[PDB]
Design a protein around this ligand. Sequence first.
Ligand code: HEM
Ligand code: HEM
Ligand SMILES: CCCCCCCCCCCCO[C@@H]1O[C@H](CO)[C@@H](O[C@H]2O[C@H](CO)[C@@H](O)[C@H](O)[C@H]2O)[C@H](O)[C@H]1O
Ligand SMILES: CCCCCCCCCCCCO[C@@H]1O[C@H](CO)[C@@H](O[C@H]2O[C@H](CO)[C@@H](O)[C@H](O)[C@H]2O)[C@H](O)[C@H]1O
Lengths: 61, 273, 402, 438, 124, 124, 55
Amino acid sequence: GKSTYKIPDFTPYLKKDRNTDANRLFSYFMIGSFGMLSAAGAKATVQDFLSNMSASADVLA
Amino acid sequence: VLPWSIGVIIFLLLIITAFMGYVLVFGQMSLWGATVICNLVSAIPWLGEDIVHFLWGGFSVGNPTLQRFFALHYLMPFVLAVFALLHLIALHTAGSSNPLGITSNVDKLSMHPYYSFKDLITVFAFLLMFTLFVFFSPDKLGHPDNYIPANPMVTPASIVPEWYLLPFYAILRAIPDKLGGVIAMVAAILILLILPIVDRSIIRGNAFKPISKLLFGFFICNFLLLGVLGQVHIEPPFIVLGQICTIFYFSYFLILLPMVSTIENIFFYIGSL
Amino acid sequence: FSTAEAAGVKVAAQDGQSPISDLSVVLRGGSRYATVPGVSHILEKFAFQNTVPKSALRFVRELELFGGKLYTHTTREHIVLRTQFLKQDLPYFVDAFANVLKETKFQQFELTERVAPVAELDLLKRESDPAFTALEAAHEVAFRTGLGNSVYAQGYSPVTLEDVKEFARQVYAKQNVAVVGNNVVPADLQQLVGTAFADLQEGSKVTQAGTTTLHGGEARVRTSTGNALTIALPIAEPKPVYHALASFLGGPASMPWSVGASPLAQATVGTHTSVKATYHNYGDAGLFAITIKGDSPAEISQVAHKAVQALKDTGAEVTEEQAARAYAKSKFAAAEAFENPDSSASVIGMELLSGVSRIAPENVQKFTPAELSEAAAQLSASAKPVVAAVGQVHALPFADEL
Amino acid sequence: VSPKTRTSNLKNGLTIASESNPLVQTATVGVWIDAGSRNENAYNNGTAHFFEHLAFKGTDKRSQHQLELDIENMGGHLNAYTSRESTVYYAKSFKDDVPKSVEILADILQHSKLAESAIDREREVITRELEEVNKQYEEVVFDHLHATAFMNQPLGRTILGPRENIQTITNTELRKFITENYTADRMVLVGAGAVDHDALVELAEKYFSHLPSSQSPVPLGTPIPNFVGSEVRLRDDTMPVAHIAIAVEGVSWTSEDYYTALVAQAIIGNYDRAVGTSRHQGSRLSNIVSENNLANSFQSFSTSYSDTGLWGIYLTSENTTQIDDLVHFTLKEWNRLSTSVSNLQVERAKSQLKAGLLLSLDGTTYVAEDIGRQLTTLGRRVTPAEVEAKLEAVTEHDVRAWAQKTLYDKDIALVGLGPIEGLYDYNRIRNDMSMMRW
Amino acid sequence: ASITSVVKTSELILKSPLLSKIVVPLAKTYVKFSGYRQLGFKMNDLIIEETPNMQLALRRLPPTESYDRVYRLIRATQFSLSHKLATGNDITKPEEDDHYLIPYILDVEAEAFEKDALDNLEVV
Amino acid sequence: ASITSVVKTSELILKSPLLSKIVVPLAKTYVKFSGYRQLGFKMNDLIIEETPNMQLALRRLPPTESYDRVYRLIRATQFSLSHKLATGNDITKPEEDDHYLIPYILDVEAEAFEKDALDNLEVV
Amino acid sequence: MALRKKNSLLNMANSYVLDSPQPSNLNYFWNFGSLLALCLVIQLATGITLAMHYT
Ligand code: HEM
Ligand code: HEM
Ligand SMILES: CCCCCCCCCCCCO[C@@H]1O[C@H](CO)[C@@H](O[C@H]2O[C@H](CO)[C@@H](O)[C@H](O)[C@H]2O)[C@H](O)[C@H]1O
Ligand SMILES: CCCCCCCCCCCCO[C@@H]1O[C@H](CO)[C@@H](O[C@H]2O[C@H](CO)[C@@H](O)[C@H](O)[C@H]2O)[C@H](O)[C@H]1O
């Protein structure tokens, strides 16, 4: 309301175990999973898509 | 350094663009040029043959290759325009250099109207040369064999690239190894990227450097001779001459320019004391 | 401090039981000797620039390896260059001072890019305090030249490389240099100075251009950054009693959250103002000053009246209690000044360079109430009062009002 | 080699510690107390600082005026300061004025009046202090830094306390505070300069013998802080200089990493454009900052408490469009403590610190402050030989291991004051706590 | 290459009697054929300036030397665009071809190189 | 449309008894349904400011009014991104919805429009 | 200065995709711009590929 040294209430959001390795590791697991599926999705996409340039079925026949 | 380095890529894109466009005619030189140039990729170790079949879309140059070259030939000029714009934006930080090699920050002119009107002179000179070829001698720079339809059976007497690729072809022939020759040929273009390092001069450019000017003259004439040797038959004595010219080409970057530029530095300093 | 001589240079050292040594070169090159205004400040800032044996860069990088520190300041009397290091690294520091005095390359780019900008930041930081400005202005009015020269380099009068090089030619000479070593073995310092400063010019004693003349007057420095007022009284015969009188009149509190029991401290009650009486002995003249700063020009004016009254009241009668309080506060001030390395160096520097024997804190004279009141009486009845006002000068007092 | 610190105890458990210097003529005696604002709760926050004001407002014998006079007659001065974990009350005097000064200190600590009239008078003075700290930007920045790093915890509270408490602090709660906290087992009587130890112990037996002992005497410097990665922005476009502090949770006094954190701090070091030598310093950050004019100054710090600490940097800059670069380059120098530091930087910082820790003690007040701090945080004065050995034990592997667990990819507490529009949001600052190339 | 390099190598040659006997006459002819004097330049006007070190050295030139350099560059640019050569007093005579900039760049580089060395010091 | 236009037309309506009787109640409900008060805005905070005239009017606001406007905009932006509404004292009460900016913009526009007129004067 | 700001080419990308200052309250309807860029990229990739096989 007036004093700027009285931090507003963040208790509804604060985690108690915020400084722990487990805490960070969980968020990096989510980031990592997302990076993993993006890598696997990119690989699948690139491989299937670029295969159009390999000899078509009529040519292989 | 940055506009120059992007420039080297522009030059590679222009080569690829022109090579693919030449295939599109599907005359004898189109087919056989595509065959021999695309087979250089077979030299890539382990995967080379697989890559060639992938590029061709089959087991030899044929319809799949021609249709993909059309699509890429249409695309590549747009990529080239983007890189041409990039090298100008990179240049804009320093501005154009000038023939004296000094700063021009002391004395600038607006691009328009001065260089607009000076560009018109060379535009009209260019259009005169264009007119003489296009209207009076339209086939002077071409190969008659490209007016024969592609025939995979008959091999033309001599399979050569278009004239502007001939120096790189001479460099490739000079190395006996297939992979060696491909590397040398690519290195001949990529070595332009080291000029910023091997030029040790404290002065920009050759206007005031008599020895550098002589060396540059020999370098340029050697590059023209390599061009000529690219279209001779593989016969004596052109085989050895091609090897000597190739050594000269590379030694300009690796030995002569570093040495001459070092010595000229010392001559400027001692000579003006 | 055992005073001796090593190769024509006066060396004073006092051994101690600490891992920390302070070595100071004191130069007779303060602002009263300044050839052109501000040159002594510029020369001070040009210490530890590029020398011929060692660049400024190399010096700083090596000083960091010894964990040494460097302190320089300019007074009206001296330039002081002090280094603080571990005892064992003494030879390095002696040699560094030798390089500065013998072989400083005074290069124009150092002056433009390094020395003058730092000198300008130095002054701007000092002037943030309006009381500093007021006391500087008061010396300028009181003495005009010599002691009245500015200590610091100012923008209105630029110092050139030729100015600084000429001044250094005079100052950096055996006749103007004293070495003071705190917690330095005296025999070891003499041996090192004797080898390092042997090839320093002999030169001649730097002198004040002209005799010290006293003047009264007013200075009205209009700023927008705080308010202050100095009431100075130039002294033609500097006497040690004025130290006792300065400490008696006092001004600062001896206790947190208090006003204090000193007459000048009691003059500030009901105001957010501070006061400090100071006495400056310069050998041949002196200045007794009372400086008052505050945020309100009205309050400063109010205190200024009470301050001059306090001085008059003192001239009337001092009690025995008050005279003893003056002796105690003055002995203490003497002791802490001889402890503080900055002031210590200049004290022995004055003894060595002039011949003014130091007064040990234990030998500080006790002044009777008669002697104190007599000293205050002379000041209240001065023919040449100086008043420097800083800030909202239209609202600050004038000399004739006081 | 400095004289030995002598240490004695009384029966109540008051420690007396002294370091004599026969070369000086002044002496600093005082009382270091292992107590401060952190010992208050939320309701009496501000009490410790309030008491400091009243300690000089009169005792059962000497009135306010008599107190003033007695000290004036001594010749020296008295000084006091209250911090989060420590309170100090000392007296600088002449050699032979030491018995007077011990007597006055003993009086103001044990026998202070705390008269309702004086409580009421100071209650306005302290209320005015709330609106004038506002000017001391470094203190504003550090107080917000503690408030956010230790959000809703005792270390997070200010020393002055809230306006609300200032209006409601009674003589009862003042008396309660000093009775609970100012006990003999928490106090050290320190003398430095021209003091005799045996004389000081006698003066302690005369004046501090009727001090209460605490019921459960823990050792000196005995304490759980849960650091919050967070930011406070106090944007003020009218200020010309930005003040920024960035910190991570650091080390306590008795951490095994205490010296490692000091060495790491020395690798970054300090910088000030106003000092002539600063453009030539070896620190990489110093070189970046000075070459590019990114800052007026920066100061690395490693603040310790009994059970936690803050390690970080305080920056000031007028370069308001390149604050981003200043913060970027600072945090990339911290990254290098994890990824790149070798024996080159570590041995250079050790050299600089071996001297620095000794150089700091250059007067009797500094010596007394060193004896008092060390006795109330560690329980003993650590000899320079032990300190030289602990510094020598720091290797480059220790620094890298410490930075990888303390700095690398960790949350920061960040405070910006002034024209800080160019300071990016929390994520972009915190993303510089790691390097994607590593 | 750095000016420092060029100056040091030149000094090695100028020391050696044999070397100087063969190199100095060559260097003088080189300078004559170079032809920069025919545009009214001094040798140091040609040194590449788009470098931090060179920008710093140029900022340290005395104002007079700096104003004269600006005029020589403008004058040479005007000869270049006109395809003319200097005549008369505009031609730089050998005695006017002074190394006005070399001492400044050598000082800038001395510091730059010492900084690099000292950034790699190892406490022994 | 110009603020001047809006203000003049509004004054014509407020004059006419009949018109005000039917328009004022509509305008009050409009403002209630508009819902800008529920983000703690005052009406004038919504006026487009990216014009020379409005930039000039904003520069003429008294410092306190200007600081308070900045806070209302920041606070409203935080409600918008959070998908929350103001509660309690953050809601603008009808008595707080003052036309703090209208007098400034009307003065700026008065001059701008007089300048346009006078640029087209014809000496008779 | 950071390379992304100092280098003119990097700085152009930087100005549009990285340091570009955005309002803090754009809602999901501000996402169609990047979806349109995605459609344009898919159409270029698939279209150029179809051109390699189309007559
Ligand atoms: C499509 C091809 C290209 C176009 C349209 C193009 C266009 C231009 C233009 C308009 C300029 C500025 C004016 C001028 O100096 O002529 C320029 C400068 C430059 N270009 Fe190119 N260019 C192209 C290819 C290249 C290539 C292949 C290189 C290098 C291998 C290159 C390197 C440069 C350099 C270094 C400059 C700066 C020269 C200077 O002013 O000193 N460009 N280019
Ligand atoms: C904005 C980008 C584009 C849009 C909206 C677009 C739209 C379309 C549409 C509607 C068709 C008819 C598709 C069908 O029903 O079969 C089509 C066909 C085609 N487009 Fe595009 N196109 C785009 C870009 C391109 C590009 C860049 C190419 C490059 C050549 C291209 C090549 C083709 C080809 C070859 C076909 C015919 C084969 C087919 O029908 O699939 N398109 N396009
Ligand atoms: C920089 C990127 C590196 C180079 C990229 C590689 C380009 C092309 C390589 C692989 C493309 C062909 O590789 C081939 O892919 C197709 C899927 O696409 C796979 O085929 C598999 O799935 C397809 C449909 O998804 C089925 O019809 C098939 O019966 C099954 O075997 C083959 O198992 C794999 O051998
Ligand atoms: C969207 C894909 C990413 C590629 C980037 C898009 C290409 C378009 C870029 C070229 C257009 C010129 O873009 C222009 O660049 C400069 C600097 O780069 C920007 O300039 C902006 O950023 C720089 C620093 O980041 C500041 O000096 C400047 O004050 C600010 O206005 C302009 O606001 C932008 O309009």
